[PDB]
Amino acid sequence: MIKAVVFDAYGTLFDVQSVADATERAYPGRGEYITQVWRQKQLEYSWLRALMGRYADFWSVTREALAYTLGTLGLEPDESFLADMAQAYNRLTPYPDAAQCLAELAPLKRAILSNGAPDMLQALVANAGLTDSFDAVISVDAKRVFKPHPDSYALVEEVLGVTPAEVLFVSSNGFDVGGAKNFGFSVARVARLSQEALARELVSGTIAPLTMFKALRMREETYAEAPDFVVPALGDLPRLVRGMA
Amino acid sequence: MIKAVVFDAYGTLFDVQSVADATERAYPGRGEYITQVWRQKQLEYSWLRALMGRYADFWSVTREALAYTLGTLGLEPDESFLADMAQAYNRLTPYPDAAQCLAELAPLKRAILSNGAPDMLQALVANAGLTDSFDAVISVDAKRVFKPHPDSYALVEEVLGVTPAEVLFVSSNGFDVGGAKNFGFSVARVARLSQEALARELVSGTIAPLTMFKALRMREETYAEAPDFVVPALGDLPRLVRGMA
């Protein structure tokens, strides 16, 4: 039976677009651009560092990705500036119905499995006021890999003591849904962007920057095994788990 | 001493934009979009499949990436349609100066190290009439990983009997430059997009779709070791090798 609900962090429980106000500062007029590329490169760098066998924690990844992004704009900020701005990733606003969701899931074990480095995750959850909502906040850092590497998902059993079959994994990220499924978890994908809306947006005339990234990041990935469930919001999870098993 | 010049294929020797006509037929008015997302997802899927430890050859990856891309537009092509259109990747036009470059590089050992499946590569190289320009056309397939996994680069010594130190690796792809450097090759990066032009393009007002992808794919990656050399075109490599030795 489902004994634990384990959540992806960035993009699932926390809004990675909420760095917008801060990025709009590093380049007025380019906040949206920066937000999108920063996130895209954060992901790419986590995958590429892991696949090369050259791990560095998510804090290093986040700053390298920011440096790349600002560099495309012709900037060359120093490490101090990068470290200060990157703190935006430790203050992402949780999704509105995150709190209520975790609450209604109080009976079950509740955890996070994230690429985020140990200190990033504590700040992020604390700042979101959700520290008391998790029995464990698990960082991939100990394994020195990034999702979707199987060793990342292995941590759930190592920490919670439950087997893959007894875990409901939750993510808004297609590649993470894929990695969780490959590992053996049941998965609930959070799909906040309706496929039909994206399709029409993509033909609504000239394709805007933001549309490109939605197109790259907010769909199920074709190589991946389908999630067991798809809900439009975290709030639908408790009711999903009720009439589930 | 440099005894062999090993080339990345897609994006380096061959123009991944040359699928322009096939994609425009697939969805008139959206050929540019499809071209860009197809290539982006092709890369992502190669990385993610490898990192999950769920390898499929580049032919499956290419078809899956295409299926994803067309799906964003609201289409649902059958496998027959996908296999047919994906053929476009086995017809990529080589860059105008590749032939000359390869010619002037003899009698140095010359090879390709590519994600492409064996059949994709031989059909691609044959169609461009470059079969006799290479001592070896190496697919990563034997190792069942994708670049930048170190095993893919390990194939070079296995096939050519030259050590990493005796190899000049050539690539226009930042992640591949990074992988080859991590492994131990000397690397010449082919940089077709001037940083200063990109920076100004990204400030020129509304950011056209195509600018996004250049922004994502045509720079050195911040996590990667810097290439030993950077040239504007493949035609410059023979000159580079001389002034080098």
Q: Do A54 and B149 touch (CB under 8 A)?
A: no
**Which tokens sit at B164?**
């990493």
Measured between alpha carbons, how far is A2 from A156 in angstroms, rounded to an integer?
A: 13
* CB-based contact A191:A29 (threshold 8 Å): no
Strand order through the sheet with A167-171 = A136-139, A109-114, A4-7, A167-171, A186-190, A229-231
**Which tokens sit at B229?**
């050399």
Q: Which residue stretches of B18-149 are H helix?
A: 20-26, 31-52, 58-72, 79-86, 98-105, 118-127
Interface-testing mutation among B76, B216, B225, with chain A (most A C-beta atoms within 10 A): B216
- The DSSP call for residue B137 is E
Q: ∠ CA B109-B112-B116 to the nearest 5 degrees? A: 160
For residue A208, give the nearest of B31, B207, B210, B27 by alpha carbon: B207
Q: Side chain identity at B15, as an amino acid letter?
A: D
Measured between CB atoms, does B116 come within 8 Å of chain A?
no
Q: Closest to B199 (Cβ–Cβ): which among A49, A72, A195?
A: A72
**Which tokens sit at B2?**
């440099």
* CB-based contact A30:B212 (threshold 8 Å): no
The yes-or-no answer on residue B8 being catalytic is yes
A chain contacts of residue B48, beta-carbon cutoff 8 Å = 47, 148, 175, 178-179, 221, 223
**Which tokens sit at B198?**
């990109």
User: Quick one: how far is CA A62 from the chain centroid?
Assistant: 13
Min Cα separation A209/chain B (Å):
6
Tell me the three state secondary structure of residue A188: strand
Measured between alpha carbons, how far is A125 from A138 in angstroms, rounded to an integer?
A: 12
User: Is A43 exposed, middle or buried (CB count within 10 Å of its CB: 0-12, 13-18, 19+)?
Assistant: buried
Return the exposure string of B192-202: e unless at least 16 CB atoms fall within 10 Å of the residue's CB, then b. Answer: eeeeeebbebb
Q: At what angle do helices A118-127 and A58-72 cross, to 10 degrees?
A: 80
Measured between alpha carbons, how far is B191 from B171 in angstroms, rounded to an integer?
A: 9
For residue A5, give the nearest of A232, A174, A229 by alpha carbon: A229
Tell me the three state secondary structure of residue A111: strand
**Which tokens sit at B54?**
């769920």
Q: Closest to B223 (Cβ–Cβ): which among A45, A216, A223?
A: A45
For residue B20, give the nearest of B39, B7, B46 by alpha carbon: B39
The verdict on whether residue B189 carries a ligand-binding annotation is no
Tell me the three state secondary structure of residue B243: helix
For residue A139, give the nearest of A5, A3, A10 by alpha carbon: A10
Tell me the three state secondary structure of residue B124: helix
The B residues from 148 to 177 touching A (CB cutoff 8 Å) are 148-150, 175
Q: Closest to B73 (Cβ–Cβ): which among A29, A36, A199?
A: A199
For residue A152, give the nearest of A119, A176, A173 by alpha carbon: A176
For residue A70, give the nearest of A25, A126, A132 by alpha carbon: A25
Q: Which parts of B157-200 are beta strand (E)?
A: 167-171, 186-190
Whether the ω angle into residue A227 lies within 30 degrees of 0, i.e. cis, is no
| Bridge partners, residue B91, by sequence | none
Query: How close are the terminal C-alpha atoms of chain B, in Å?
Result: 7
Q: At what angle do helices B98-105 and B237-244 cross, to 10 degrees?
A: 30
Measured between alpha carbons, how far is B104 from B98 in angstroms, rounded to an integer?
A: 10
Measured between alpha carbons, how far is A167 from A241 in angstroms, rounded to an integer?
A: 11
Measured between alpha carbons, how far is B148 from B143 in angstroms, rounded to an integer?
A: 12
Measured between alpha carbons, how far is A61 from A59 in angstroms, rounded to an integer?
A: 5
Min Cα separation A152/chain B (Å):
10
In angstroms, the Cα distances linking A2 to A5, A80, A231, B233 are 8, 45, 17, 57
Measured between alpha carbons, how far is A174 from B64 in angstroms, rounded to an integer?
A: 14
For residue A51, the chain B residue with the least C-alpha distance is B149
Measured between alpha carbons, how far is B183 from B177 in angstroms, rounded to an integer?
A: 10
Residue A233 CB partners (closer than 8 Å, separation 6+): A95, A97, A190, A192
Query: How close are the terminal C-alpha atoms of chain A, in Å?
Result: 7
Measured between alpha carbons, how far is B150 from B154 in angstroms, rounded to an integer?
A: 6
Q: Closest to B207 (Cβ–Cβ): which among A146, A196, A209?
A: A209
Q: Side chain identity at B77, as an amino acid letter?
A: P
**Residue A149: left (phi > 0), alpha (psi -120 to 50), or beta?**
beta
Output the CA torsion sign for B208, B213, B219, B221: positive
Whether the ω angle into residue A148 lies within 30 degrees of 0, i.e. cis, is yes
Measured between CB atoms, does A197 come within 8 Å of chain B?
no
Tell me the three state secondary structure of residue B186: strand
User: Quick one: how far is CA A174 from the chain centroid?
Assistant: 10
Q: Side chain identity at B126, as an amino acid letter?
A: A
**Domains in chain A, start-ordered, CATH in brackets?**
1-15+91-241 (3.40.50.1000), 16-90 (1.10.150.240)
Where is A183: in which H helix or E strand? helix A174-183
Measured between CB atoms, does B204 come within 8 Å of chain A?
no
Measured between alpha carbons, how far is B135 from B152 in angstroms, rounded to an integer?
A: 18
Q: Side chain identity at B165, as an amino acid letter?
A: A
In angstroms, the Cα distances linking A75 to A64, A90, B12, B201, B208 are 13, 23, 27, 14, 20
Greatest Cα pair distance, chain A, in angstroms, is 54
**Which tokens sit at A12?**
């699932």
Measured between alpha carbons, how far is B226 from B220 in angstroms, rounded to an integer?
A: 8
Tokens 């070896």, located at residue: B136
User: Quick one: how far is CA A108 from the chain centroid?
Assistant: 22
Measured between alpha carbons, how far is B132 from B141 in angstroms, rounded to an integer?
A: 22
Tell me the three state secondary structure of residue A168: strand
Q: Side chain identity at B145, as an amino acid letter?
A: V
Q: Which residue stretches of A73-133 are H helix?
A: 79-86, 98-104, 118-127
* CB-based contact A90:A97 (threshold 8 Å): no
Residue A149 CB partners (closer than 8 Å, separation 6+): A50, A140, A143, A179, B51, B52, B53
Measured between alpha carbons, how far is B235 from A9 in angstroms, rounded to an integer?
A: 47
Whether the ω angle into residue B238 lies within 30 degrees of 0, i.e. cis, is no
For residue B138, give the nearest of B128, B151, B224, B127 by alpha carbon: B151
CA trace torsion B34, B39, B40, B43 (10° rounding)? 150
Strand order through the sheet with B186-190 = B136-139, B109-114, B4-7, B167-171, B186-190, B229-231
Measured between alpha carbons, how far is B123 from B86 in angstroms, rounded to an integer?
A: 13
B chain contacts of residue A213, beta-carbon cutoff 8 Å = 212
For residue B179, give the nearest of B208, B143, B125, B129 by alpha carbon: B143
User: Quick one: how far is CA B121 from the chain centroid?
Assistant: 12
Measured between alpha carbons, how far is B117 from B60 in angstroms, rounded to an integer?
A: 9
Tell me the three state secondary structure of residue B190: strand
| Bridge partners, residue B225, by sequence | none
| Bridge partners, residue A6, by sequence | A111, A169
Backbone angles phi, psi at A112, to 5 degrees: -125, 135
**Which tokens sit at B38?**
């197809």
Q: Which parts of A12-117 are beta strand (E)?
A: 109-114
Tokens 């990705």, located at residue: A65
Q: Do B207 and A207 touch (CB under 8 A)?
A: no
| Bridge partners, residue B110, by sequence | B5
| Bridge partners, residue B94, by sequence | B14
Q: Do B53 and A223 touch (CB under 8 A)?
A: no
